[PDB]
Amino acid sequence: MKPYIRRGGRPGDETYYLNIPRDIAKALGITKEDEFMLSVETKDGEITLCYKRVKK
Amino acid sequence: MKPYIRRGGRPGDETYYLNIPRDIAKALGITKEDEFMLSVETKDGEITLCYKRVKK
Structure with a gap:
């Protein structure tokens, strides 16, 4: 998957996201x-990039 | 940190995202x-969840 990048008005305020596919999210x-x-x-x-689930 | 959950009608037809903080995104x-x-x-x-970069 490609990153999910979102922007605002101000330059340099962009934010970056990685998707969790539906069935992987559902299985987890x-x-x-x-x-x-x-x-x-x-x-x-x-x-x-490792996201370790720490809570819930 | 928590997931970025966007749209859905409720039935597992939702979408899930994990944020990359901007300066980690920039540094990479x-x-x-x-x-x-x-x-x-x-x-x-x-x-x-581990996201390995396989193409720049």
Whole structure:
């Protein structure tokens, strides 16, 4: 998947999002109550964004 | 941090997103054409969503 990038009026106020596909979200029971801790790590010498579910 | 949940009619026809903080996005040079491969793992015994960049 490609990143989901949103903008406002002011230049440089853009925000970035990664999608959670429906069936993966459904299989994981992901809800608006969940909390994630984000780490940056290496997977196969490539850059990885890891969201660890910490709450709910 | 929490998920960015957007639209839905309620029935699991919702969409789920995880935010990349702007300066992590900037430090990784994230642009709209980057490609990410989503994998699901355990970290400290908790579910982790890992997004590996597979194309810049």
